[PDB]
């Protein structure tokens, strides 16, 4: 909408106060004009029609329980935009500052979040498996990263290419979580998963097997559920990424860690310069080796560690 840029205040899903960029024109809208061609947050009103209505508020204060998922979707989309711009010199998901749109309060009891080809969508959860999913910064960044992937490598959402697609979203979700630097970890979705169980998460990158996901290519899932295991076999790549950054010895193979920043540079370059819609795990290894070679040189530690990490998870 046309209006003037304003700054509202509200509370997110976890009860924390934050400022949010809004737009005033009769109402205050969840429309942040400070980033690209805008970040826009919508109310889906417990229905499945999308996007719903652009979020309107009478007083620019967002402290109601119903407001909390909108506050976080809007704010964390801003953090994710900032990460891509400041760290990777990428302007929104398409590289040309496309408007970023999210809808909250999608459906009833909906235990998921997704990119639908055009926008982000967040359920409220059923209060048992999830609370409103925009409360997780890693979740928000996971979803926006699907849009980045779709505009760049275009990884098809099935089998190995789809597991890479998933891992890319977990990797950058985690790197955005570290960028914001509030309780960062290598776990996925811990802030909104299972409110009655402490200390768990939907996936672990540091130890995928903690939740039954494979941590070695020889343990990959080969069936048809979950688009050929895209959220399962992602553990193999997540583990490799974790090892590149943090190091470790895994199935007897030692990896010297090179840190998060270099992990992000290597995988961002792989995603945007080398991967294709049908890339498999072996081709991802080759893309990461080439990317590290471009950035750091063929004889570098960074290249050697990429090779070590993929060896550790059984990907040649
Ligand atoms: C980080 C997480 C809390 C949320 C994450 N959602 P996502 O990967 O973005 C789910 N996208 C999808 O299906 O795209 C495919 C698609 C959907 C709609 C239109 C086009 C394409 C996830 O890990 N979900 C699991 C939750 N057991 C799942 O969906 O199995
Ligand atoms: Ca209000
Ligand atoms: Ca965390
Ligand atoms: Ca996390
Ligand atoms: Ca939990
Ligand atoms: Zn995903």
UniProtKB/Swiss-Prot annotation:
Its EC number is 3.4.24.27. It comes from the Bacteria. Ca(2+) 2 binds at residues 138, 177, 185, 187, 190. Its cofactor is Ca(2+); Zn(2+). The keyword Magnesium does not apply. GO terms for cellular component: extracellular region. One of its GO terms (molecular function) is metal ion binding. Belongs to the peptidase M4 family. Extracellular zinc metalloprotease. This is Thermolysin. It comes from Bacillus thermoproteolyticus. The gene is npr.
